[model samples]
Target: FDRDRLFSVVSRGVPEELTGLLEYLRWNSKYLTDSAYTEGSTGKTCLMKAVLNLQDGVNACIMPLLQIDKDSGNPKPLVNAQCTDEFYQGHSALHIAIEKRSLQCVKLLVENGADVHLRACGRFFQFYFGELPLSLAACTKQWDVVTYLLENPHQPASLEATDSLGNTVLHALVMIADNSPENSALVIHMYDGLLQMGARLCPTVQLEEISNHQGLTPLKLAAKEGKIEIFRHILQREF
Candidate 1:
């Protein structure tokens, strides 16, 4: 009944016998309905921990046992489904999966109905907050995962959705380009993928000159970084 003990079992790698025992306990009706059995010292429930750790196999084994309270209206077995936990600095399971570049895990979670649009606050309060799962994948340079997510029927194809910073995912990528050559490469790659996916690039000539609160346009920032390819990509466009 101790949540920490159960976590220890998982963290230490559950033995076959204990795994079976845990599975049994998970399935039993009495334990399923008992709140005490589900509670963790941290706000996380058993399922949340599994998700945070990307423990897919363990999660698959345990999911059936945990019953969602009918009143919560959470359709999935994953409790606090699609919600970001504070401990993760406001990242959801989807965020962690993307940051970790766990493509299979990201795909599995998304297919199982995780929210790709979930957002968390950025590390700096002044910067943007939670970005789309696709953007996170892009930032982590998980091109395949970004492709998978963007191509999925449920995924948003465009970066039009505003983040906490009021900037679109494309805008965020361009902004990140100012930080380093590696980020510049990521920005260009993401732009390429977005175009391949049929995303329309808006003309930003005027927007480039006018600084947002961040004081940089996509073109301006790209130029400053000497990301000539990105600069030309924007300039040559029919903007």
Candidate 2:
């Protein structure tokens, strides 16, 4: 493919005719090192842009170019340098997929060996959602994805995984207490599931700040929202 034509396709977004050519070149590793062909003004690569836009077909075409381990043939994914990207408040592709509710993309990336434990910027206790992907999912109320990720073979349930703010998944949910009912229920389910999976009900970052006059945990945040069933359900858990 001509350089100018390739650049146009990559810049304007992937087109049908260009899809085959792009995939072919990517599979053959012919244009892999041609930075100009894929670089965006924001320093995002074509692949990154496609994923950010949830362009599944384009993303599928560009997937081969991402560096992966040679022996395992797994994708070696990384967020932008220092972990800044427009998607998901400057989170990685993993975070983007979760935020966008792109279940298929999330599954595909995980299948190709994406890092579930990759942390974004900020030290523990600084960021709203600490180091855990589960918490992010919980905050967004993506129950199916959250459940899948937690139960997936590679990711063990860990309620204590703190985000940069030193907050656990539960803490993140409490931070967004006024969002919606679905969100509150999702958090309750997650808390129960995590306990069943052997995770401890440990205090996460901002645990004290979120407590009520009676010193209740973020679980009380759900009760404040009038989700008595959820609160009761959580209370019945063996945490």
Candidate 3:
């Protein structure tokens, strides 16, 4: 019943504690999504906590909470609960799952009807604030997750949408470019892959002409940020 205990149990990934908590909820005729378990300040739910704590394989802690609660008066899926804390406002369980690079968790949440377009406009994701689900996967460089989201049968990601900063996924990649051999290659690969997936560019202007809020296009931002490899790569690519 205590928010602290619930959060701790989920984050710690203790199977027994989670099972016991679920049992208690059932006995009390309560749903796992009850407001009682959410932290008032952060708006972080048990599902979010469980997702944050996920490692590689399937998360035992998250599944139970995501199950349908038929007997509860109000049954709401916790997958889309947004964090209201100023720093991470609008972050959902899906966002954390993507951030943690857990494809399994990502799939589970998505299949359960997680809002794929949910934006995380938190300061932590600044410059790319109001970042959509697809952008988040791209920014984090999660290849599998990106592929899954891009080809999601239910609802594919919006390749043409820009973030709060008015940066496209390609622009976001350039902003994070470091110029190291591996990193440069990765950035280039992602750039090409996105283009292959029909990531839109301004047809009337040069590729470098489409600007963000800072009035910098992907190529210009790459040059300005001194991401030499990516900058040069962009120049070499034919429009």
Candidate 4:
């Protein structure tokens, strides 16, 4: 019943000890779901905490935690668990795994049936609200994670899903882009990558144009937001 110790062990990424703590927690049905280990203020689950504290080239205790929930046969598996508070709502362990740039964790969560389209519409992320798991990877320029999500056999990324702001993934890039060379290059790379995956490019067909709430497509948004690099790149596209 020592939830504090459980949370700490997970954050520390200690797998050996975590197995015991998790096994104990699962013995009691209450801890089977995410609520038992989730922080009320930020709504971060133990799984999220583990992903947050990942060690480079070292596996975290994420698998054991997920194993416990999965073996318990809980309908609401922890792997798909989300934060609950307003500022963190709709954010599952998958979001943190992708944001942390751990391709292993991302694959682990997705392979466990995590929803790629789960929306993170929390205020804490500010401009990143309403981001899907893949959109978050795209915005952060984590191409490895983005590629995995795009090609993964389970719940592959959707190229055309718009966010809460009515912005597609391209719109996400336009909103976050800048003029810096590195940023411009990566942003353009991601834009081109998305387009290669059959993303709409604001064509003349009104119905096919992907626009935001203001009806601005990625090209127009790039211009309005002063992302000249992306704007120029978009203009150069013959289609």
| lDDT string, candidate 4, 1-239, tens digits | 46588777777777777656545655665554555566667767777778888888235677787787777667877777777788887888888877777888888888877888888888887656237887789888888888888787888887778778888877888778879998899888888887766544323333225778998988888878888888888888745
Q: Rank the candidates by lDDT, best first.
A: 4, 3, 1, 2
What is candidate 1's lDDT per residue for 41-101, written digit by digit as tens? 2334444455555554334423332332222233444422433334434455666566656
lDDT of each structure? Answer: 0.54, 0.53, 0.75, 0.76
In model 4, state the lDDT of residue 238. Answer: 49
Candidate order by decreasing TM-score: 4, 3, 1, 2
172 Cα displacement, candidate 1 (Å) = 1.4
lDDT of 2 at 223: 72
lDDT of 1: 0.54
lDDT of 3 at 86: 87
Clashing pairs in 3: none
Write down the TM-score of every candidate: 0.65, 0.58, 0.80, 0.86
Error of 1 at 140 (Å): 1.4
lDDT of 2: 0.53
Per model, state how many residue pairs clash.
1, 10, 0, 0
Highest TM-score: which candidate?
4
Lowest summed-lDDT stretch of 10 residues in model 2? 68-77
